[PDB]
Amino acid sequence: GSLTEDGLSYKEKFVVRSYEVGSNKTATVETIANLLQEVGCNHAQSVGFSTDGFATTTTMRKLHLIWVTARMHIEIYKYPAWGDVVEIETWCQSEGRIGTRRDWILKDSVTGEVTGRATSKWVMMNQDTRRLQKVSDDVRDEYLVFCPQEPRLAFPEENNRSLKKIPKLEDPAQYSMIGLKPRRADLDMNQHVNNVTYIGWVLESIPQEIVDTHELQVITLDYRRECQQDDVVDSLTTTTSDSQFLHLLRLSGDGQEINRGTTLWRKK
Amino acid sequence: GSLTEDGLSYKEKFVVRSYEVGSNKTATVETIANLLQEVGCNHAQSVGFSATTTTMRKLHLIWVTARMHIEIYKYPAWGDVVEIETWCQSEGRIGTRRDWILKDSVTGEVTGRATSKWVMMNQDTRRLQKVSDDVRDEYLVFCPQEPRLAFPENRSLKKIPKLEDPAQYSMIGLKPRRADLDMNQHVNNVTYIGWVLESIPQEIVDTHELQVITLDYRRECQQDDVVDSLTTTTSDSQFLHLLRLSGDGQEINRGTTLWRKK
């Protein structure tokens, strides 16, 4: 991968692997989200944040802070096939002093066709206390020069789906998958549950019939609180409709919300 | 990746990804196993497979893994390039074998090796059988016919005993999610590696590196099955492992691992 000509975004090509695809031999959305992470990380490295930390800045490393996803929104028009090459462009932008966004555009590497778009919002956590905080001025100042100054949005429209408020699912749920637990492969290098595991857990309570007949077009996921390695999660889904669903992940042990989201599916 | 000049082995380079590494920022053994299957798959495709010989398809036969054995000297770091060379060999009527050698791209030093044994299964009945002459003779043209052993000495062929109840350690009630399924909706062979390792104490994983894993595969975990992972220390630290389906206690894997203090 490499920085683009203006130095303010990063592009990388990925060849879709055999184990990264589902039953129609195209990348799963979990694969896509993992590639979003990888190209984001490689972006951070390209501008000088070394592999001694998980895309953290030098102030973060000093203060024992790590990055935490607050929201992920992914829209896929076409999933790349096994052995195909997808090119992903990514950039970071601050929303004043209030928000920190990373955006992505996915393209067919050969034809240049846009095949998907994504965006994300970020906060930080103290790695020791696990307490969340907003990105600080001292942190942002370490990468602001590497970011576009005029607005650059994967989803530019006012009131677009990416910014929509997600309601809380009300019991009873229509569908559930109970007792999901992380294994070691689900952990990132910081020993926190990786952000893509929550996407998988949300999708686990989608009925097989939908998965067999439909493709996921949109996922919007808020991240309220982390699942720790010894926690157990229930995934709850209700139809709100294309087919659309409302999602809630919560801890088995007390019912504490860890995520809420929505998904939009299109018949194959 | 590409075939080598003689057409009898295949090489591919991988850049180790952020989500592929553990707490020491080096590739996990499940990452290694994933890269092994990927380079395997690319090799098979490069020699014209889809993987079944025309004769296998006619007789509704598939290859299934009987054993995976992995030995790692050094796990590649985040962002490092690992080069993997793989080849296959016929083991006459018994089955076939796929071998791998892992190298540091930069130094050319061998950082690991692996070997897997494959047996023929009827896709309908799920019963194992021997390799027929026709299947053998079709396979051979893709393989070095002189033996080429990643493990020439060995631990890779050793018989593994069945763990006796009670187990020292356990992780109970493991279940696959969708990401664990392959394109045919069977559980991916690397998932079973993860499940074996889950019953190793966290204190061992935090302070030791896995040097060797040997894993026999007996029968599969289906999508709706539930697995218990059992471990007992047999010793460096060495462990004996058993995966069984908890609904009936049916064995699906047995294995051993060897760990060295960091």
From Swiss-Prot, chain A:
One of its GO terms (cellular component) is chloroplast. Its EC number is 3.1.2.14. GO terms for biological process: fatty acid biosynthetic process. It is found in: Plastid, Chloroplast. It catalyses: (9Z)-octadecenoyl-[ACP] + H2O = (9Z)-octadecenoate + holo-[ACP] + H(+). One of its GO terms (molecular function) is fatty acyl-[ACP] hydrolase activity. This is Oleoyl-acyl carrier protein thioesterase 1, chloroplastic. It comes from Arabidopsis thaliana (Mouse-ear cress). The gene is FATA. The chain holds residues 75 to 359 of 362 of the full protein.
Curated annotation (Swiss-Prot), chain B:
The keyword Acetylation does not apply. It catalyses: (9Z)-octadecenoyl-[ACP] + H2O = (9Z)-octadecenoate + holo-[ACP] + H(+). Its main location: plastid. GO terms for cellular component: chloroplast. One of its GO terms (molecular function) is fatty acyl-[ACP] hydrolase activity. GO terms for biological process: fatty acid biosynthetic process. Its EC number is 3.1.2.14. The active site is at residues 184, 186, 221. It comes from the Eukaryota. Keywords: Chloroplast, Fatty acid biosynthesis, Fatty acid metabolism, Hydrolase, Lipid biosynthesis, Lipid metabolism, Plastid, Transit peptide. It is found in: Plastid, Chloroplast. Plays an essential role in chain termination during de novo fatty acid synthesis. Possesses high thioesterase activity for oleoyl-ACP versus other acyl-ACPs. Substrate preference is 18:1 > 18:0 > 16:1. Belongs to the acyl-ACP thioesterase family. This is Oleoyl-acyl carrier protein thioesterase 1, chloroplastic. It comes from Arabidopsis thaliana (Mouse-ear cress). The lineage of its organism: Eukaryota, Viridiplantae, Streptophyta, Embryophyta, Tracheophyta. The gene is FATA. The chain holds residues 75 to 359 of 362 of the full protein.
